[PDB]
Amino acid sequence: ANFLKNLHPLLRRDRNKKDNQDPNFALIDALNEEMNQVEKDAIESKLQSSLKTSTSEYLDKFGDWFGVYRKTDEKDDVYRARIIKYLLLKRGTNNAIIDAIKDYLGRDDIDVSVYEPFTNIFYTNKSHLNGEDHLMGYYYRFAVINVSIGDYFPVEIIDVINEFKPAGVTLYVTYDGASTI
Amino acid sequence: MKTRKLTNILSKLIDKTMAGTSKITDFTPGSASRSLLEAVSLEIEQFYILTKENIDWGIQEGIIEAFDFQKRQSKRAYGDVTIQFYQPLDMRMYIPAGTTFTSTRQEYPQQFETLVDYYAEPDSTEIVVEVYCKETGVAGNVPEGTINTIASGSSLIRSVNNEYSFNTGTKEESQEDFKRRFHSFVESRGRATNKSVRYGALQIPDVEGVYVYEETGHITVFAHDRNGNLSDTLKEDIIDALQDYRPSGIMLDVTGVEKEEVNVSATVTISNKSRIGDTLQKHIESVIRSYLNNLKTSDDLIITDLIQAIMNIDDVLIYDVSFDNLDENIIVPPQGIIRAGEIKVELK
Amino acid sequence: KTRKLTNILSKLIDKTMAGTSKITDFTPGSASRSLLEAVSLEIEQFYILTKENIDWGIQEGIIEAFDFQKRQSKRAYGDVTIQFYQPLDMRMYIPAGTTFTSTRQEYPQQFETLVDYYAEPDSTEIVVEVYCKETGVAGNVPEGTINTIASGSSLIRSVNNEYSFNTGTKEESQEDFKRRFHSFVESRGRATNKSVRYGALQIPDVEGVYVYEETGHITVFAHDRNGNLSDTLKEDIIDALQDYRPSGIMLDVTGVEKEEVNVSATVTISNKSRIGDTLQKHIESVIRSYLNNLKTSDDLIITDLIQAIMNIDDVLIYDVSFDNLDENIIVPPQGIIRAGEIKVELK
Amino acid sequence: LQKHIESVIRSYLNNLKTSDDLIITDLIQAIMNIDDVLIYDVSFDNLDENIIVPPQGIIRAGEIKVELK
Amino acid sequence: MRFKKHVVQHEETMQAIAQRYYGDVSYWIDLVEHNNLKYPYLVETDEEKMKDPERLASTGDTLIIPIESDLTDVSAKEINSRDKDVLVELALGRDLNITADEKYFNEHGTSDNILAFSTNGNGDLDTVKGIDNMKQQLQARLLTPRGSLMLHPNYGSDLHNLFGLNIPEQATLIEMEVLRTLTSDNRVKSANLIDWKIQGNVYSGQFSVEIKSVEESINFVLGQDEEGIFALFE
Amino acid sequence: QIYESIDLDELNENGIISIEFVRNRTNTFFRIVDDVTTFNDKSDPVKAE
């Protein structure tokens, strides 16, 4: 917006008193309006080059680079939060699986836990004879987990756990009826 | 950038110009005012377009810079040369690194050399060595039987041959291929998952594909280079790269894919018999090599697919095709792959 | 990538000529050429602005989303108090650039106001903001440093900065910013030996961690500064590594196999008159410090101990010998050497 | 490095005066002070006990040899 | 090393500065890079500069223009009259006043123990500068017999021996000796006879001395800037 | 203030010295318009100038 400053010095910068309908001032102010609007747009353009301050189209460009695609009616703030969370996903532990379930079902108040049967392997000394422990075999074995879920689910949640669980661990999924009643 | 267009900018300029003065009322084509405002608005439009393009370029550049995810350069070709001697060697012979290998086939004048020192044991009749193309890019992907000369000059050498077509030479990484590897990075930030294991195995640039085969308490990573082999150095490197990504406490093993080595002999009839020669044979052989060496892990080989691929070269010039070694499709398992053996063509 | 002034002007002239033939003078000093030159200069300046914005976005856009601020170099600034002998008998004016300084060789830094200030008649003391002329931490002067004005009126009783300045900063390099980001990203990793070791090390009282891997079991060796592992610290490590361990894998925590080495030494000395308790205890403290400084995988090389004991004094200490230490005590990675009973005999 | 260590040992022994005893630990610290980080451990394959020199005696270097490991 | 420093003027632009100094507007980006300026390079007032004092400059702020400037090859017309006075004063040197009490050593010109130091009235030694300095030095040279001064055989004059007869010949000898003594000074560009007469005992004469011009002294002193001595060892 | 060409003409006709803004001159961005005195008899050149 240095258009008047860098303009030819002899040209008038001010609407002349002698004529309220001075065409020179009209042309100059028109061009100046467009110069200042382009400067404003160029100053506001910085917000599009940052993930923090990006908006619709450029934010979609960022999500396409990160691999995360906008959902139906998904605004910018929730979308960028979802991208940031997707980058920072903990994986390979019970807490991660529990969060993945709770974030594929609707809510947090549901009971969800992971059972590890290898804790109940029957050792000679410590394990009680008629106790909770069982003899080692196929199910009571390391690299095995059984996930108990306190609500209804699509079968596809199994595939979500396949995305989170560590490689080499057999998965079983237990629906518990006692929550839904 | 709001992506304005020329017509709106010109209309806004003309409207303001009219509003500032009632004297100016001639904005027809060919007028001075209209031309000046048109030029200004056109330049503004070009500024906006280029600003949008530069912002797109800046987003790609900041993605590259933030993670230091540098884009893959061209890879130089490499492969295995076999050698035979006159008689079983009486002694430990030597072949130093930089020993050059060349080919008398003028169609493939590229040069190769050893990057490693070699020796042979007493009472051995042949040896295998790995050689790298001196020149980078696709030029070092010579067919089988090309390399037949050794520049060491040693007398005990009877003959030299590359038993298989080289396929490891490649140009700069494509835009979509780079974009797909970055998605794998993002997924593999969680270290202990199957996709993270696959990324760590793929972290080595030499590795082409990986199939992670999963069992209870055991992981088997089937990996291969762009030729279908898996050298011990490459296996060790994959292992070292997987130390950071593999889950703790679970057994892991790295092994080479179940490579199948399809030899082909094709009898092809030609309608225009003048066109018969060495050029057409070599072109057909090249097409077959490119078809087979583009098969991925677990791609079945379908004889009719190969038939259409050969016949689409020229559907008029080529009359009929017949295979003298293949009669039924080949099933490839998940951990398997197909690669071209000797490719031969008889023109009739 | 971008147009420039000469190209913009040329295209403007070409488009103007194409639009109409009524104008053909495009020489220097022409109104029309001047107007196009001005528009071209503005567009070139907007191009430079876009270049600056994109150069900032390339190196700061993505990382900024994760609450990571790059430290910009700043001028140290703060408030100072000016006291008057009496309420002002007229409106005092302090022009911008009015310099404030300190009467010490410890702080030659000069501070100036960047804005005009006015003190009303009714006032008796007014506070103003001053900015250090130099960027860096050199401007972070302590409390009571600024105590002089170079162009103040005699009505001032005393100048004083009521708090130490701390806003001066040095620019953080790009590589350090990338290193912090990459550190954070690595810390997001879980269910690996490296991540387990990291998460154990973040605990306050943990000094050293070795992770030993077996098929279906993980055991963690930890120790404090003393080589010991308290039950409470063990429980803390377990509770912190509940989040870290892989699913379906067993994790155990154990102390480091400490080995207390007892060293009885016979030190020959030259100056017989300097033989006393203090020198004995000094030598013993040196030996104990050397033994306790050893890390988990560090083997006790007796020759280096002899070097250290002789380097206590090159002429006083004459010769050394040990009866307990006959050969180097090799220890595994999970076995730390610590100081046991120490005795020194002066000869 | 071998020649530097050999030189240091020669200079140490050929600086001994009349009636200076040779003390193996002194020689150890002299060798180790060349670089205390780079040099790890030192062992002598011909010397095991200090050498007493009488008033009319002196020590001088014979063949000096060093094996780097 | 020396560089030009520019004060931001009202509603100035970087392009105008570049045109003014570099003779082309293209160097404005170099000027920005060297001064480390953010996009609003020359803000209207200090309120805008408060937003980013480091990276912005307001009116009355000093910019640096890295063009190797040199005080020689500067048009004397620009130099202020006071600056020219100070420059010629430096050129012609400052020295301790000894020719005070003109009457006394004018009454005894040929003798020794004729001149002495004096005070400036402010408890410091008296000093003669510029034309007064030249007067002092020319008087002292004329009055000094040649060869009497230690370490300087040729400094002085032979007038003490020219107390000869009253004829034109001795007049011419005196005139030639005086012209030699005046020419001996490096600063005296030339000297020449004006008029003389003989009144029996008494001889009388007058001369005209043209010291080096203002232009030459200015050029000499501004050249001396390269060395920084600013002193006279003639 | 930045007085206009009419305001400067009024001030000079009233015998008042004024300074007018000027752009891009080699020395400074300001110049002295006139050396007029308070005596407003412009016909008399001695008293006025």
DSSP string, C298-313: --B-HHHHHHHHHHT-
Closest CA to A50 of A59, A41, A42: A59
Q: Nearest residue of E to residue A43 by CA position?
A: E39
Closest CA to C135 of C162, C113, C168, C160: C168
Token reading at B65: 């810079």
C-alpha E91/C-alpha E217 separation (Å) is 6
Per the CB < 8 Å rule, is F28 touching E11? no
Q: B178, exposed or middle or buried, with CB in 10 Å at 0-12, 13-18, 19+?
A: middle
**Degrees to nearest 5, angle at CA E101 with E96 and E103:** 140
Within 8 A of E20 by CB-CB distance, chain F residues are 26
Q: Which chains does B contact via 3+ CB–CB distances below 8 A?
A: A, C
Closest CA to C142 of C102, C100, C112: C102
Within 8 A of A97 by CB-CB distance, chain B residues are none
C-alpha C158/C-alpha A162 separation (Å) is 73
C-alpha A113/C-alpha B82 separation (Å) is 59
Number of residue pairs across C and D with CB atoms under 8 Å? 30
Within 8 A of C16 by CB-CB distance, chain B residues are 35-36, 39
Contact B166, B227 (CB under 8 A): yes
C-alpha C299/C-alpha C310 separation (Å) is 20
**Dihedral sign from CA coordinates of B276, B279, B283, B289:** positive
Resolution (A): 4.4
Contact B133, B163 (CB under 8 A): no
Within 8 A of C245 by CB-CB distance, chain A residues are 93
Amino acid at the residue A30: A
**Cβ neighbours, 10 Å, residue B117:** 11
Q: Which chains does E contact via 3+ CB–CB distances below 8 A?
A: A, C, F
C-alpha C77/C-alpha C166 separation (Å) is 8
3-state secondary structure of A121: strand
Q: Which chains does C contact via 3+ CB–CB distances below 8 A?
A: A, B, D, E
* DSSP annotation of B70: P
C-alpha B168/C-alpha B227 separation (Å) is 6
C-alpha E62/C-alpha B213 separation (Å) is 70
Token reading at C227: 């080589």
3+ Cβ–Cβ pairs closer than 8 Å linking D and E: no
Q: Nearest residue of A to residue F21 by CA position?
A: A9
Describe the strand order of the beta sheet including B251-256 as a list of residue ranges. B207-215, B218-225, B251-256
Residue recorded with tokens 């200076």? D20
Contact C339, C265 (CB under 8 A): no
Q: Measured between CB atoms, does E59 come within 8 Å of chain A?
A: no
- Phi then psi for B224, rounded to 5 degrees? -155, 155
**Cβ neighbours, 10 Å, residue C67:** 9
Within 8 A of C131 by CB-CB distance, chain E residues are 53
Token reading at E69: 């400037």
C-alpha B84/C-alpha B160 separation (Å) is 6
Within 8 A of F29 by CB-CB distance, chain E residues are 9-12
- Which method resolved this structure? cryo-EM
Within 8 A of C243 by CB-CB distance, chain A residues are 93, 95
Contact B318, B263 (CB under 8 A): no
CA separation, residue C275 to residues C269, C321, C342, C345, E133 (Å): 8, 17, 18, 10, 80
Alpha helices (H) along E93-167: 102-107, 131-143
Within 8 A of D29 by CB-CB distance, chain C residues are 306-307, 310-311
CA separation, residue C38 to residues C214, C237, E16 (Å): 75, 69, 12
Q: Nearest residue of F to residue E12 by CA position?
A: F24
Residue recorded with tokens 């992770």? C211
Residue recorded with tokens 């701390």? C166
C-alpha E54/C-alpha E49 separation (Å) is 8
Nearest chain B CA: its distance from C16 CA (Å): 5
Q: Which residues contact A28 (CB under 8 A, 6 or more apart)?
A: A4, A7, A11, A12, A13
C-alpha E1/C-alpha B141 separation (Å) is 61
Closest CA to C321 of C311, C333, C306, C336: C306
Residues C219-236 as b/e (b if ≥16 CB within 10 A, e otherwise) read ebbbbeeebebeeebeeb
Per the CB < 8 Å rule, is E54 touching C52? no
Q: How many helices (H) and strands (E) does chain D have?
A: 2, 0
Radius of gyration of chain A (CA): 32
3+ Cβ–Cβ pairs closer than 8 Å linking B and C: yes
Per the CB < 8 Å rule, is C42 touching A46? no
- Phi then psi for E4, rounded to 5 degrees? -80, 145
C-alpha C82/C-alpha C162 separation (Å) is 10
Amino acid at the residue A94: N
Per the CB < 8 Å rule, is B193 touching A167? yes
- Phi then psi for A92, rounded to 5 degrees? 100, 20
Q: From the candidates F19, F21, F24, F31, which should be mutated to test the interface with E, based on the most E CB atoms within 10 A?
A: F24
Q: Measured between CB atoms, does C248 come within 8 Å of chain A?
A: yes
3-state secondary structure of B45: helix
Closest CA to E5 of E64, E57, E67: E64
Q: Which residues contact C96 (CB under 8 A, 6 or more apart)?
A: C113, C114, C115, C116, E46
Alpha helices (H) along chain C: 5-19, 31-64, 174-187, 193-201, 231-240, 277-293, 302-311
Per the CB < 8 Å rule, is C115 touching E50? yes
Contact A49, C50 (CB under 8 A): no
The DSSP element (H or E) to which E186 belongs, if any, is none
Residue recorded with tokens 């507007």? E25
Number of Cα atoms under 13 Å in the Cβ half of residue C160: 9
Closest CA to B67 of A45, C129, C182, E215: C182
Alpha helices (H) along chain E: 14-22, 28-35, 46-51, 81-92, 102-107, 131-143, 168-184, 214-224
Nearest chain A CA: its distance from B294 CA (Å): 27
| First-to-final CA distance of chain D | 12
Contact B80, B129 (CB under 8 A): yes
Please name every residue paired with A85 in a beta bridge, in sequence order, or none if there are none: none
